[PDB]
């Protein structure tokens, strides 16, 4: 059950300077990069072309190449239209793609944010504002909805091209997506009140279980941290436990994960 995300970030600093940068994710693996400095979209995995032929990919890349130049000029012109209401610097973010389900089911989305706030989406056959959006956006929405050629292209991208492409992606990248890499654990301590820390690192995929333990008894003062990434697309996590100094004897950190195949990791203090 995987989500395909195209994440676009655009900065317009003043009327004559801007950049647009994109990265694309399938679940938590990066499949594409598109730096402002590059004419073309970059594959970050061998399978990032999916099951599209070289000619189909060219046509798709070309549509995006036209989009990027056009988006840039359109924002610049919409700014002029609303002036002096709204002004540079401006940050625009797009989150788009499709969430794949079993059978031939999917939901596609195109969400737009302006200065960090979600304000606009494509829905059905048109651009619309969402709850909490300021009223001045109704004029930009009205203008973008005037463009019938863009509406038909976007609808096709959302309804057809995304799910088709993502189905092909999943086939071509099955083995990279289903890989198992093993966690490695280690222990440490910081500041009579100690904090004990169980470090776990190098595990893929993301789901994992980490608890502090006395033999067969889960110490439910354990505070699990956030999942932090490593460069090689594996994960890092730490679970902390508070204790009285001297009382650290007999505590262990137990780590369960799908790559271990039953044989859990236990490290005793």
């Amino acid at each position: 059950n995987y989500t395909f995300r195209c994440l676009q970030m655009s900065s317009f600093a003043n009327r004559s300077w801007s950049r647009t940068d994109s990265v694309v994710w399938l679940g938590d693996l990066q499949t594409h990069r598109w730096s402002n400095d590059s004419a073309t979209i970059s594959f970050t995995k061998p399978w990032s072309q999916g099951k599209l032929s070289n000619q189909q990919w060219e046509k798709l890349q070309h549509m995006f190449q036209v989009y990027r130049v056009s988006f840039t000029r359109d924002i610049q012109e919409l700014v002029k239209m609303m002036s002096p209401k709204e002004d540079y610097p401006i940050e625009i973010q797009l989150s788009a793609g499709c969430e794949m389900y079993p059978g031939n089911a999917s939901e596609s989305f195109l969400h737009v944010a302006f200065q960090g706030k979600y304000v606009v989406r494509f829905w059905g056959t048109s651009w619309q504002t969402v709850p909490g959006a300021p009223s001045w956006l109704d004029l930009p929405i009205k203008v973008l909805n005037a463009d019938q050629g863009t509406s038909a292209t976007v609808q096709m991208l959302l309804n057809d091209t995304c799910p088709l492409f993502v189905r092909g992606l999943l086939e071509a990248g099955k083995s990279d997506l289903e890989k198992q890499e093993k966690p490695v654990a280690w222990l440490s301590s910081v500041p009579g009140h100690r904090q004990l820390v169980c470090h776990v690192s190098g595990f893929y995929p993301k789901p994992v279980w980490v608890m502090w333990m006395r033999g067969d008894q889960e110490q439910q003062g354990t505070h699990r941290g956030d999942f932090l990434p490593n460069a090689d697309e594996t994960w890092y996590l730490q679970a902390t436990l508070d204790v009285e100094a001297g009382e650290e004897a007999g505590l262990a950190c137990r780590v369960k994960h799908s790559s271990l195949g039953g044989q859990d990791i236990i490290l005793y203090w």
Epitope: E77, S83, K142
Partner: T-cell receptor, first 111, second 113 residues
Framework: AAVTQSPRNKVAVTGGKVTLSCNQT?????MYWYRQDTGHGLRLIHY???????EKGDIPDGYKASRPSQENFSLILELATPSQTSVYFC??????????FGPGTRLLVLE | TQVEQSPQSLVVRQGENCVLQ??????????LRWFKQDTGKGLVSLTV?????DKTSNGRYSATLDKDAKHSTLHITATLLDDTATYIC?????????????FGAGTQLIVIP
């Protein structure tokens, strides 16, 4: 959807102030001024997205624009030159791509 | 320039047909319009072509557009004296008022009565 220009024809002198005006009663937010010269297609001078806004076109130099109301968009030549001898067309439109043109204004600028 | 029109001018006898060419490099290409301009007068719209491969008609004027070739032709059947005019090709790069129009310099037609 009709657009009027005034004056329809004008003779002016170098250094003189010429004001070309455009009126439009359709409640269109957007207006546009072009000049036409032999051997070129129409070229955009200035445009406007609403009252109080003016924007530079492709060839803005020697021209100031002015949008005092929704109805009127004026092209001002503060210090007119012979190179501004041309036919000037104004246009308006709403949020769609169609631009509706006025009938044109001929300007001759003599020494 | 981004919009080239051919021929630059032509002389035809009343009742003959003629073909007018427009080639462009404009990107993107949302729509293409043909104007007629009588000497000293205004821009009268003849037809607007919007599709990938498009055809239109309007009495004696008919036209075509191929977006892949970036090419349009205007055909005038059975020319009349009043077709003496300049014919102008315009390409619009958006389907909204965010667009710019890219004007061709025009083909001059003279019909001999």
């Amino acid at each position: 959807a009709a657009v009027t220009q005034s004056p329809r024809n004008k003779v002016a002198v170098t250094g003189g102030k010429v004001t070309l005006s455009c009126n439009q009663t359709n409640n269109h937010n957007n207006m546009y001024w072009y000049r036409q010269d032999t051997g070129h297609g129409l070229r955009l001078i200035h445009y406007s997205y609403g009252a109080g806004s003016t924007e530079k076109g492709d060839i803005p130099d020697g021209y100031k624009a002015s949008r005092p109301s929704q109805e009127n968009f004026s092209l001002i030549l503060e210090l007119a030159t012979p190179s501004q001898t041309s036919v000037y067309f104004c246009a308006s439109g709403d949020e769609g791509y169609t631009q509706y043109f006025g009938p044109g204004t001929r300007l001759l600028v003599l020494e | 320039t981004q919009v080239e029109q051919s021929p630059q001018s032509l002389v035809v006898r009343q009742g003959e047909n003629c073909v007018l060419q427009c080639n462009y490099s404009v990107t993107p290409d949302n729509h293409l319009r043909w104007f007629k301009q009588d000497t000293g007068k205004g821009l009268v719209s003849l037809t607007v072509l919007v599709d990938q491969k498009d055809k239109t008609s309007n009495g004696r004027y008919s036209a075509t557009l191929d977006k892949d070739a970036k090419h349009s032709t205007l055909h005038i059947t059975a020319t009349l004296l009043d077709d003496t005019a300049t014919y102008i090709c315009v390409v619009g790069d958006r389907g909204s008022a965010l667009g710019r129009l890219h004007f061709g310099a025009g083909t001059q037609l003279i019909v001999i009565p």
